[PDB]
């Protein structure tokens, strides 16, 4: 058992709705454990009030840079980056959650949320969970992206944690 984690999504201040996630902790334990603990902020840091800095229609929505806010920041709960844990789970279609990285062994806290089937990401980004509820709020999120990733609204994780 891994408890389901959520993000609350606000846009420009105004709430947009809630996203829920299920994480594959039995296949991928410290990667799943990382996005779960950064969701609570139990370690005195994590995803709360950090903007989604890269949003691209019909590909993915990316966040979890909570330090720079730009796509060069983020850090794991273990400190610095971690090794690619297990590449078993395929990017099988929308609502897949998977780890944004800059090449080998760089998984910090950043992630991206698939809104298309992205088969070429298999073996390069660990798939570590899957969308439980709130996928159409990530459809509402994508609308505020552009083709290069440039967001045209400030899109902010209002609140985050875990669910009994």
């Amino acid at each position: 058992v891994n408890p389901t984690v959520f993000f609350d999504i606000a846009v420009d201040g105004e709430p947009l709705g809630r996203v829920s996630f299920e994480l594959f902790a039995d296949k991928v334990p410290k990667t799943a454990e990382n996005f779960r603990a950064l969701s609570t902020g139990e370690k005195g840091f994590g995803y709360k009030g950090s903007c989604f800095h890269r949003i691209i229609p019909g590909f993915m929505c990316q966040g979890g840079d909570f330090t720079r806010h730009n796509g060069t920041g983020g850090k794991s709960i273990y400190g610095e980056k971690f090794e690619d844990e297990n590449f078993i789970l395929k990017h099988t279609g929308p609502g897949i959650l998977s780890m944004a990285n800059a090449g080998p062994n760089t998984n910090g806290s950043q992630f991206f949320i698939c809104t298309a089937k992205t088969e070429w990401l298999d073996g390069k980004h660990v798939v570590f969970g899957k969308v439980k509820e709130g996928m159409n709020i990530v459809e509402a999120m994508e609308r505020f992206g552009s083709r290069n990733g440039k967001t045209s609204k400030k899109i902010t994780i209002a609140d985050c944690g875990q669910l009994e």
């Binding site: 890269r54 691209i56 590909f59 993915m60 990316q62 840079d65 730009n70 796509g71 060069t72 983020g74 944004a100 990285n101 800059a102 090449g103 760089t106 910090g108 950043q110 991206f112 992205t118 990401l121 390069k124 980004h125 083709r147 290069n148 990733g149």
Partner: protein, 218 residues
Amino acid sequence: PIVQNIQGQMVHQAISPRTLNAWVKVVEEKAFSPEVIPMFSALSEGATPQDLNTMLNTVGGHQAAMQMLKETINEEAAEWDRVHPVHAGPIAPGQMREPRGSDIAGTTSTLQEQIGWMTNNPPIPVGEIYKRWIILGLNKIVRMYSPTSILDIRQGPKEPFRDYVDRFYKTLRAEQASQEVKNWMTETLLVQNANPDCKTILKALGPAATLEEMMTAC
């Protein structure tokens, strides 16, 4: 390279063997003289990293020189990587990644990627950046083999002022000193290392003579 207009259509083809014969020849003929450098530049117009590597690989001579150079290039490749972080997360369709030090070296990249970077709008000139990282190592290899110190350039007893100037300027070429330090040297050190009988004539044209007024005499 890119061929028939770098701002045209962006047609591409391989580094000519006719370029390569002329390139192997000139290091054979001319050593690590600073004359092989603009020769390198004029051969390398619109060249990819894959093309530049073939220039180095084909030479077969000069293997300590080439090694010392490839070591110097890897230090500049390392600086590029160090200065530039890559922005994290996956490449979108139609789009391309930010180039690292070994990408421009051509070792963790392919031609398909190199052409992408080079022919994007606006163009990212990875060829040029890596041609400069070569030339920066060539300058050092040139200087290593360089004729002996400029500060020790002193006109001989059976030597004309023209040959002295010749020799002075030839040493000034393979010197990598500032063009300010070189000017002041052309002005001061030239004369004060000159031979007495020539120095007298040189001084007697007074301060701030043109090289031609000097060469006309002496």
